[PDB]
Design a protein around this ligand. Structure first.
Ligand SMILES: [Cl-]
Ligand SMILES: [Cl-]
Ligand SMILES: [Cl-]
Ligand SMILES: [Cl-]
Ligand SMILES: [Cl-]
Ligand SMILES: [Cl-]
Ligand SMILES: [Cl-]
Ligand SMILES: [Cl-]
Ligand SMILES: [Cl-]
Ligand SMILES: [Cl-]
Ligand SMILES: [Mg+2]
Ligand SMILES: [Mg+2]
Ligand SMILES: [Mg+2]
Ligand SMILES: [Mg+2]
Ligand SMILES: [Mg+2]
Ligand SMILES: [Mg+2]
Ligand SMILES: [Mg+2]
Ligand SMILES: [Mg+2]
Ligand SMILES: [Mg+2]
Ligand SMILES: [Mg+2]
Ligand SMILES: [Mg+2]
Ligand SMILES: [Mg+2]
Ligand SMILES: [Mg+2]
Ligand SMILES: [Mg+2]
Ligand SMILES: [Mg+2]
Ligand SMILES: [Mg+2]
Ligand SMILES: [Mg+2]
Ligand SMILES: [Mg+2]
Ligand SMILES: [Mg+2]
Ligand SMILES: [Mg+2]
Ligand SMILES: [Mg+2]
Ligand SMILES: [Mg+2]
Ligand SMILES: [Mg+2]
Ligand SMILES: [Mg+2]
Ligand SMILES: [Mg+2]
Ligand SMILES: [Mg+2]
Ligand SMILES: [Mg+2]
Ligand SMILES: [Mg+2]
Ligand SMILES: [Mg+2]
Ligand SMILES: [Mg+2]
Ligand SMILES: [Mg+2]
Ligand SMILES: [Mg+2]
Ligand SMILES: [Mg+2]
Ligand SMILES: [Mg+2]
Ligand SMILES: [Mg+2]
Ligand SMILES: [Mg+2]
Ligand SMILES: [Mg+2]
Ligand SMILES: [Mg+2]
Ligand SMILES: [Mg+2]
Ligand SMILES: [Mg+2]
Ligand SMILES: [Mg+2]
Ligand SMILES: [Mg+2]
Ligand SMILES: [Mg+2]
Ligand SMILES: [Mg+2]
Ligand SMILES: [Mg+2]
Ligand SMILES: [Mg+2]
Ligand SMILES: [Mg+2]
Ligand SMILES: [Mg+2]
Ligand SMILES: [Mg+2]
Ligand SMILES: [Mg+2]
Ligand SMILES: [Mg+2]
Ligand SMILES: [Mg+2]
Ligand SMILES: [Mg+2]
Ligand SMILES: [Mg+2]
Ligand SMILES: [Mg+2]
Ligand SMILES: [Mg+2]
Ligand SMILES: [Mg+2]
Ligand SMILES: [Mg+2]
Ligand SMILES: [Mg+2]
Ligand SMILES: [Mg+2]
Ligand SMILES: [Mg+2]
Ligand SMILES: [Mg+2]
Ligand SMILES: [Mg+2]
Ligand SMILES: [Mg+2]
Ligand SMILES: [Mg+2]
Ligand SMILES: [Mg+2]
Ligand SMILES: [Mg+2]
Ligand SMILES: [Mg+2]
Ligand SMILES: [Mg+2]
Ligand SMILES: [Mg+2]
Ligand SMILES: [Mg+2]
Ligand SMILES: [Mg+2]
Ligand SMILES: [Mg+2]
Ligand SMILES: [Mg+2]
Ligand SMILES: [Mg+2]
Ligand SMILES: [Mg+2]
Ligand SMILES: [Mg+2]
Ligand SMILES: [Mg+2]
Ligand SMILES: [Mg+2]
Ligand SMILES: [Mg+2]
Ligand SMILES: [Mg+2]
Ligand SMILES: [Mg+2]
Ligand SMILES: [Mg+2]
Ligand SMILES: [Mg+2]
Ligand SMILES: [Mg+2]
Ligand SMILES: [Mg+2]
Ligand SMILES: [Mg+2]
Ligand SMILES: [Mg+2]
Ligand SMILES: [Mg+2]
Ligand SMILES: [Mg+2]
Lengths: 189, 148
RNA sequence: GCGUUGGAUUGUUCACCCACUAAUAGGGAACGUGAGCUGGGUUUAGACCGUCGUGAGACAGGUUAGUUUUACCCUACUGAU
RNA sequence: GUGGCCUAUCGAUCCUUUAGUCCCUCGGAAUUUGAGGCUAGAGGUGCCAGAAAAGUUACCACAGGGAUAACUGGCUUGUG
RNA sequence: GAAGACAUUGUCAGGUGGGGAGUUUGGCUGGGGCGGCACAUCUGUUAAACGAUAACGCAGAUGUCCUAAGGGGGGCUCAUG
RNA sequence: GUGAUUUCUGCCCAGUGCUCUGAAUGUCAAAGUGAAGAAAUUCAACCAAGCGCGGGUAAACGGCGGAAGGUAGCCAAAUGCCUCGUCAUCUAAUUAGUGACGCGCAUGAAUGGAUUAACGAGAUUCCCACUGUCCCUAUCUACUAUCUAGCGAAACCACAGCCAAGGGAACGGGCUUGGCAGAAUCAGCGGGGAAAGAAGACCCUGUUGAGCUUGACUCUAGUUUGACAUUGUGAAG
RNA sequence: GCCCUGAAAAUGGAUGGCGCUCAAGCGUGUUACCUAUACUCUACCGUCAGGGUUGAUAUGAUGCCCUGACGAGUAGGCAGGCGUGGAGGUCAGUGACGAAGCCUAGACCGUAAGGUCGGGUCGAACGGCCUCUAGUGCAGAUCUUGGUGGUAGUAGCAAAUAUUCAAAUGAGAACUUUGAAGACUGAAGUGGGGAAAGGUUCCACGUCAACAGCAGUUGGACGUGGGUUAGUCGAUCCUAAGA
RNA sequence: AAAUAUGUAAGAAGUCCUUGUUACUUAAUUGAACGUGGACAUUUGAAUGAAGAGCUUUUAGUGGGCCAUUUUUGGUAAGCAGAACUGGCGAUGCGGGAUGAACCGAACGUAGAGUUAAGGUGCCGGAAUACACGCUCAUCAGACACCACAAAAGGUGUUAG
RNA sequence: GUCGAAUUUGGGUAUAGGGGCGAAAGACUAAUCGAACCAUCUAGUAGCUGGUUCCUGCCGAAGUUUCCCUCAGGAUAGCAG
RNA sequence: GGAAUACUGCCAGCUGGGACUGAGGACUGCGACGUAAGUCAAGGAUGCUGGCAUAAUGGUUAUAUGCCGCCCGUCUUGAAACACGGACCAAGGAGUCUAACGUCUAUGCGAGUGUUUGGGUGUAAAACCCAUACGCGUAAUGAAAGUGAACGUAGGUUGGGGCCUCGCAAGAGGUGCACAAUCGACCGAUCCUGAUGUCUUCGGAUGGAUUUGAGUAAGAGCAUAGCUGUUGGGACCCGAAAG
RNA sequence: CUUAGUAACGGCGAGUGAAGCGGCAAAAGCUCAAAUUUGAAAUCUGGUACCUUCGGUGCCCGAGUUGUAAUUUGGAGAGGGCAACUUUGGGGCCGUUCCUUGUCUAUGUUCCUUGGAACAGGACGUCAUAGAGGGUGAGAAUCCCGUGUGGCGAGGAGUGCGGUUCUUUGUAAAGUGCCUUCGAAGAGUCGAGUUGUUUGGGAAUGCAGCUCUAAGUGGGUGGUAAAUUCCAUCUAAAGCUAAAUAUUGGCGAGAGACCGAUAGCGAACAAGUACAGUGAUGGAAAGAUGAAAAGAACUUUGAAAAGAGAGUGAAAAAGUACGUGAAAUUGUUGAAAGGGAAGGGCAUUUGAUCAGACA
């Protein structure tokens, strides 16, 4: 059962696995179904763009916080700063998320600009029903794409103050490690 | 394909290559990793030393994202600059025209110093740096800026 | 070459006596011979006793009851065309 | 002179426990208990490369074995 | 009529429990069993003058003992007649 | 549990069980209570039943020697190894039978001992009558077998079917060397075909089972004991 | 030294047999002769190794050619090939003027797996080559299903006392019908009715391929029809163990 | 104190002359180790041979053996049990031993010719009823290794000493 | 053997698989009993027995070492392609 | 005293009879005989002649004769076995597919590589096109906190194919990739040394150590496919007593 | 898709094993309880009459204050005060979107040969947004049905919406600024101990039994038990909700490098049928005459079944035991051999039989 110089393998097939095998024979069929469903939904919703406008947010975690992506919806504060109510925003094609909060001025200002540009690029048909026939744009994300914010200029002058970056990192670790013991010794005295 | 397998060659040879004496039985020696300490010990002590036992200390609810820190050496530092712009910066090695390299935007966490860089000033922004890497960058006239 | 027996007890081979007789010599043939017989013994399952075992049970110890199948083929043999 | 003049006198993983280092971790941040790691020993497997283990079957079962006993035959002839 | 905050019932805890359940009940071996250990080791011999070398071969031994019976130095010489 | 009647059922409570209005300061769960600590926690005291200790119990399990040492009886008995025991009787001759004898391998008292008229498709020995069981075979009847007309299977089958010796997987129809050997056949016959009927029920092996037993290992229904809940009201020591 | 005594086993018997005596026996010496898939030389097949040759105007430089050596084989490994169902491409492939399949002690090619042709039978599809793919090759498994032998015109068709003569019918009578005779069951029957169970087996006409282990004109067979009549006999009602 | 087996050496990674390094070593430039430079070529350091030598990865089957000569243990012995070296069978036909897994000879592509091995040449049966010197007469002669058995003790049988 | 009774027997009814029933043989429970029958889990597992399908060419073994509840099996080294 | 003969050996002395073989396919080579031309037995057979032209040779098949040949498959040290399966014939009948992997090989690209989750598109399960991520690789080492790979032509020495210089050649010198051995240097772990400076306990510079790592030292990997091997799966096919 | 065979669990053995982030498909939000309408229960089932009938109106009982409507669900929100503008609701009809259906919409059967049959071969044409497929006496684009491209109808569903038309809903409703006072938010429940089970969850992941049982700047969580001090993050013990996902059943369709009557479902057939079992259950075998029955009139032999002729057909070498018709096994005829098997190998004789070249 164990022979030769081979890696240790862990193949989890000791249950009735053959009863739960899923082969995606309908991969091509489902692609046709999704394309048909998108086409019939676009014809149903008039010239509406088939998707709602989304804000730009910072991804969490230290690993992914260097990038911005699309969030669920604009906050109540962002909607209010744009000059309209949340209820009217939902009926006009804007996603609203009540549980997200604003703590960064850069993110808040950018989402305010997105709402203002969106309002100036759409036409809202009156409730009377005359309904002038306008061409349908199938995507709002492509019309309003998300770009990573600029960080630094291409070239700049060298400014060295004589300090050491390695020394700065080492001292930062040391201060955090011994903060508790230093306070106790100071308090006991 | 079946037509190239040795099963086709074994047609008409009785034992199908498994021998007359030993034969091909179901599971002589057990199934899987059975008998790793009793009758398969020699094959485990060699080719797999360290298999049995425990060493370190446990860590409940590990999150690999906390330990994300890809490393980049100095010998590949200039590859982060587009090729069309590398040549002009190399030939124009001077202050107040030093290129800025943001290694975090390239997906790197710590800068290590292994190779040798050209004697050209460069502004390197990184989260972490080794002691040797900073010295070589400063020796060429550049600086390291810590970011978060 | 030719003969080498009749009986009491025992499942007995063996053994031991009675008697007759010229004589009651020893052996082999898959320890000749069970589709030839017989089935008393051994050696399935029931049951009893003694000793042993806490017990289920054991005993090359004793005791009693316990299904013996098929030839029309080939050859051999005996006779017959 | 790194135990007994020499050739034998002995023991893994897991777990427990002790000594050392007073060092590393408890992952939102700290102090103190507690717990978990690092290095070196001890508690033992004598079936001694180390499963935790009482019988009976004459009511019996299965896979096999002439690799193996209870008849002849063959070799041997101590014994007769 | 009796009985009474006790019985009863519910949940944990200790005992009892082959009535019942599940499982186990080494190996080597001139068959197996009983015995023995040739199962981890040591000395001499079998062993055929390098080394290696079998049998339930032959004659024995080991699971200890010692603050000295360990280490160094000095002086001395034993059995027996 | 023993197993009609008659007669009689001895001694042993140390062991294993069963049982007790017996004793107390042994062992002892959870809850509760106390101390220590900042707490987790730790330690200590108290402490139910059972166990332990003490008594009873053999027509309970069982024992009866060189806790008590087999009493009354009975026996080479369905129980005695040695053993075909010894003596007597029965026969011409008896490993049989019967009557006695008993240091009885290993008889024995309701795990019942001994004795018993009647009864028994039970197990044994002898005698009379009787007979083909035998000396020692012979003969008769019916139906088969046999032959014909019609009807018409099965077992089994590597290929097949004459011997002697040899060697060989140590017992050949075939191989080697010899003997020999002539179509097609019928009724019989049980020497051989290590004939046929079944993957040996005996024996061993397998890290294959099952039935049954027991202070084997690990558990469990039930039952018992304590705590808490159900669970309130009044008084006293 | 040779010979002899010592020297006894079971079916008949083996210097291999016959047979052999100045041997065809024993000891020893000298020559001739016989024959293995061994040795020597030659041809051919294959394998391995070392080499030669791109220069057009003729086809395979995985081609052609030169030189030397070698060849046993279970378990097992590797290499080059043969055959089968289906798929892409190609041969503007074969075919009702006969495709496939089958039969053929007829012919040819290959060491072989196999391939090709003629003759007969037959009636509607099928093949070569380059590649792809697999539910791809049978003598065995007390293999599965189906079919068929030897045995073999053989074992056998022998319990329950027993049949016989004549006529009628019919292609056909030991077995059907009628008559006559001889027998048996012997009233706890081989008689006369029923309960369960069966389900049309009851009755008539027609009728014999199969069934009645011989026969058959007969039948509980086959075909076509007919037949079971209740206020009083039962069910229905009652309660039993119980459900 | 053998025989048979058994370790090492027989050159270039060698020998020689001079002198550089070090924290080791010496009373000490004493030594040790490692080097710079110079001198000595393949009768370059015995024999014979060498379908080339060196090296790596991967994986099948097998892990019941048995026999013969010699050495050898237990056992009265065994076609018994157990070891040592080598050769065989197993896995292998072919000629010989009548016959036989292991003995003798010899190992195999398809054929032709020649010559042999072991074993044979009265007949079966291919080949001298050849040659030569002796021995033996059996009322149970004898006849070819492994191998299919015979002893102690005897004979004025006959032969030689 | 027994034959007027612990007799024989029809129909109705009750007891169902670790259960029933047993004047007790491990007997009987639909030809099935020391634990019935039917379907499924289930193609249950097997170090054990049997079988395992075309040709030619080249090379070509092992029954030995160490460890294993190892002794009819594996791992490991060797031999082979 | 002089010969002969026997025995053994040698001759690049001569010559007769018999058998088997004829491979190759212009020339080329080495020799012989010749003043010459030429010839020849000199790197493999030609010349002459007869009969028959078909079943005559030959093939196939049946039979006869000589010698030889035991029944296949299977387990086994050993099978023709008195060991097991097999009366006969037809058809069916057993190493498969999948997930994850080792070695090797082919292909694309290469410090990178992978279009097919999904989107676009379409002659519609095909083909064609594409963003962002993610996987693996490009850094290791510690239990962990953590730290993190150049003294030097990315080192020295020995052996190295190829190339360069000189040389007729033989050789000598120079340069030396891959690879092999060895001594160093660098990174992490462990054990020591503890500078400038201090939240007076922080900080850890510098220099060491018969210690240790699946490391560095001018990258090799990623993807697809194939044979072979591994593990889990019914797992090459058929088979238990049980639960 | 990935994280990942990873953290972790495990006689730490055999084995087991998630989650956050990141890319993508699909996207959608919400409402009760807890407040006095209190200058007016403003709410609702049912009955009855009528009507524009998936309902409406009037009237009358009843339910209900032990709470039915309006108003407010934590993102908030409510009671007062001030100043401002912004926006409508409910039905007919005609079309569109979708589904279920019907109908219409090209081109040779022209010559020759073979054949029973032309749908074969050969010659000469036509159509093609139709050369998919099937049928018709053999391989048919053009003989028939269809196929391709379009036109013209018939009957419904859903109000998704493209136009027209009838009703003013309403001193109605909703949104937005500022000041002030407030801001009710779910109990045998959270949580805790213990027991059992379960999980990767480890001083205990979820679930359940028993015991104990909260708080309101509170409560839960922050993957190592505890005390103390902070921080972060949500708001339990009440409720509704499309799409992306699943589908060996049902109904309607389209396909395959799948099987081809011992295969493929057990079943291509009067198949879950015949048949077996008391019962639960078990469970087969079985497809092919020919284009067309044209299925053999009539004669003759026989009691009859049938036979022999005749006849039908392209073929009775297709006769309802029917396409093709292999092997085992069997009959007849012909040839050969045979003294207790047969069969085989090498070589040649004899008999039979046969190809090749006559250059
Ligand atoms: Cl191969
Ligand atoms: Cl016992
Ligand atoms: Cl006769
Ligand atoms: Cl061929
Ligand atoms: Cl039941
Ligand atoms: Cl012959
Ligand atoms: Cl570390
Ligand atoms: Cl726990
Ligand atoms: Cl169906
Ligand atoms: Cl049934
Ligand atoms: Mg082979
Ligand atoms: Mg096999
Ligand atoms: Mg094996
Ligand atoms: Mg297998
Ligand atoms: Mg062990
Ligand atoms: Mg006998
Ligand atoms: Mg008999
Ligand atoms: Mg007999
Ligand atoms: Mg017999
Ligand atoms: Mg008897
Ligand atoms: Mg008995
Ligand atoms: Mg001493
Ligand atoms: Mg935490
Ligand atoms: Mg051991
Ligand atoms: Mg143990
Ligand atoms: Mg044996
Ligand atoms: Mg004697
Ligand atoms: Mg309770
Ligand atoms: Mg039990
Ligand atoms: Mg044993
Ligand atoms: Mg030695
Ligand atoms: Mg009495
Ligand atoms: Mg007595
Ligand atoms: Mg007596
Ligand atoms: Mg008594
Ligand atoms: Mg014989
Ligand atoms: Mg013999
Ligand atoms: Mg025989
Ligand atoms: Mg013979
Ligand atoms: Mg003969
Ligand atoms: Mg007879
Ligand atoms: Mg016989
Ligand atoms: Mg057997
Ligand atoms: Mg059996
Ligand atoms: Mg074992
Ligand atoms: Mg068991
Ligand atoms: Mg002679
Ligand atoms: Mg030869
Ligand atoms: Mg050879
Ligand atoms: Mg070969
Ligand atoms: Mg044809
Ligand atoms: Mg034939
Ligand atoms: Mg046809
Ligand atoms: Mg197959
Ligand atoms: Mg077959
Ligand atoms: Mg075979
Ligand atoms: Mg068979
Ligand atoms: Mg008869
Ligand atoms: Mg007869
Ligand atoms: Mg009879
Ligand atoms: Mg009669
Ligand atoms: Mg009578
Ligand atoms: Mg009468
Ligand atoms: Mg009738
Ligand atoms: Mg009849
Ligand atoms: Mg008849
Ligand atoms: Mg009828
Ligand atoms: Mg084996
Ligand atoms: Mg032996
Ligand atoms: Mg073998
Ligand atoms: Mg011989
Ligand atoms: Mg001759
Ligand atoms: Mg009765
Ligand atoms: Mg019994
Ligand atoms: Mg299987
Ligand atoms: Mg099975
Ligand atoms: Mg070879
Ligand atoms: Mg075996
Ligand atoms: Mg001829
Ligand atoms: Mg012959
Ligand atoms: Mg002959
Ligand atoms: Mg012969
Ligand atoms: Mg054997
Ligand atoms: Mg054999
Ligand atoms: Mg067998
Ligand atoms: Mg058989
Ligand atoms: Mg077949
Ligand atoms: Mg097959
Ligand atoms: Mg495969
Ligand atoms: Mg079990
Ligand atoms: Mg699980
Ligand atoms: Mg559960
Ligand atoms: Mg844990
Ligand atoms: Mg924990
Ligand atoms: Mg819901
Ligand atoms: Mg079928
Ligand atoms: Mg037809
Ligand atoms: Mg025809
Ligand atoms: Mg036909
Ligand atoms: Mg035939």
């Amino acid at each position: 059962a164990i022979s030769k110089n081979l890696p240790i393998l862990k193949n989890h097939f000791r249950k009735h696995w053959q009863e739960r095998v899923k082969v995606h024979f309908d991969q091509a069929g489902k692609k046709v179904s999704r394309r048909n469903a998108r086409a019939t939904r676009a014809a149903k919703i008039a010239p509406r763009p088939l998707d709602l406008l989304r804000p730009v947010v910072r991804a969490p975690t230290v690993k992914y916080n260097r990038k911005v992506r699309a969030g669920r919806g604009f906050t109540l504060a962002e909607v209010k700063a744009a000059g309209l109510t949340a209820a009217y925003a939902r009926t006009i094609g804007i996603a609203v998320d009540h549980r997200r909060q604003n703590r960064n001025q850069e993110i808040f200002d950018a989402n305010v600009q997105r709402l203002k540009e969106y309002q100036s690029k759409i036409i809202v048909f009156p409730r009377n029903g005359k309904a002038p026939e306008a061409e349908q744009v199938l995507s709002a994300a492509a019309t309003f794409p998300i770009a990573q914010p600029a960080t630094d200029v291409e070239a700049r002058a060298v400014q060295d103050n004589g300090e050491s970056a390695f020394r700065t990192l080492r001292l930062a670790r040391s201060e955090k490690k011994f903060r508790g013991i230093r306070e106790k010794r100071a308090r006991e005295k | 394909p079946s037509r190239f397998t040795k099963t086709r060659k074994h047609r008409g040879h009785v034992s199908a290559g498994k021998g007359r004496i030993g034969k091909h039985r179901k599971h002589p020696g057990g199934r899987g990793m059975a008998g790793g300490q009793h009758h398969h010990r020699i094959n485990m002590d060699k080719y797999h030393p360290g298999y049995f036992g425990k060493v370190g200390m446990r860590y409940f609810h590990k999150q690999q994202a906390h330990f994300w820190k890809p490393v980049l050496n100095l010998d590949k530092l200039w590859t982060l600059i587009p090729e069309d712009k590398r040549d002009q910066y190399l030939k124009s090695a001077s202050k107040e025209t030093a290129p800025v390299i943001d290694t975090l935007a390239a997906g790197y966490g710590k800068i290590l110093g292994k190779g040798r860089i050209p004697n050209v000033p460069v502004i390197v922004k990184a989260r972490f740096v080794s002691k040797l890497a900073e010295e070589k960058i400063r020796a060429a006239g550049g600086v390291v800026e810590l970011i978060a």
